[PDB]
Design a protein around this ligand. Structure first.
Ligand SMILES: CC(C)NCCCn1c(Sc2cc3c(cc2I)OCO3)nc2c(N)ncnc21
Ligand SMILES: [Ca+2]
Length: 203
């Protein structure tokens, strides 16, 4: 149950990190923008798919991004109800503008994170967890089953120096500033809370 779960990045794939991390060392807060763009792209996809597929939205009828800081656990979560990724996509998918050009903006998460977890659910596959420290990565079936319904959560284990991204004022100011790639609603969990009115619509 390891040779089918533990993998390592391609030599070009690992080299691409050396470009992203070294180049954007002064603009670390670009990561939220990049993650939010991907969420919007994945929302565009399932929305386009839903034009031709009347069952496309069955597992989650909502088209949103929801951001929530878990300061107690040192975690930042970015959750979209987009197209999601299959296991095959999680396994095989491997300068502020150039990052968005070649599609590698996702790995700007490692400017602020020691470890990135991706939980995704695609309509044609079970829910899976991908995790990496940017040296190796693994992909496993999610033991919690289908909790997302459809879409993708990006979970960031923040570095000690990135503590500020667990703060509500910081993440809210960043989301408003980087509402570049969103014509879908973006919410921030505005609580540390019990109800659905605890989401603040950011855009
Ligand atoms: C070929 C296809 C799978 N690539 C499109 C972008 C992949 N992707 C991305 S970027 C990404 C995500 C990864 C990844 C590499 C990238 I680049 O390895 C672990 O999870 N974010 C997405 C999201 N929120 N929803 C759906 N798909 C997402
Ligand atoms: Ca299905």
């Amino acid at each position: 149950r390891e040779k089918s779960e533990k993998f390592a990045f391609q030599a070009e794939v690992n080299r691409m990190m050396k470009l992203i991390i070294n180049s954007l060392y002064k603009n670390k807060e670009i990561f939220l923008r990049e993650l939010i763009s991907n969420a919007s792209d994945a929302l565009d996809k399932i929305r386009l798919i839903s034009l031709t597929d009347e069952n496309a939205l069955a597992g989650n009828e909502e088209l949103t991004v929801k951001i929530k800081c878990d300061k107690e656990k040192n975690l930042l979560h970015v959750t979209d109800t987009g197209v999601g990724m299959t296991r095959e996509e999680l396994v095989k998918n491997l300068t502020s503008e150039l990052i968005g050009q070649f599609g590698v903006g996702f790995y700007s998460a490692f400017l602020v994170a020691d470890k990135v977890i991706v939980t995704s659910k695609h309509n044609n596959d079970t829910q899976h967890i991908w995790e990496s420290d940017s040296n190796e990565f693994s992909v496993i079936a999610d033991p919690r089953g289908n909790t997302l319904g459809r879409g993708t959560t990006i979970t960031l284990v923040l570095k000690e120096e990135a503590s500020d991204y667990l703060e509500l004022d910081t993440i809210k100011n960043l989301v408003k500033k980087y509402s570049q790639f969103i014509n879908f609603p973006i919410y921030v969990w505005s609580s540390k809370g019990k109800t659905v009115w605890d989401w603040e619509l950011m855009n």
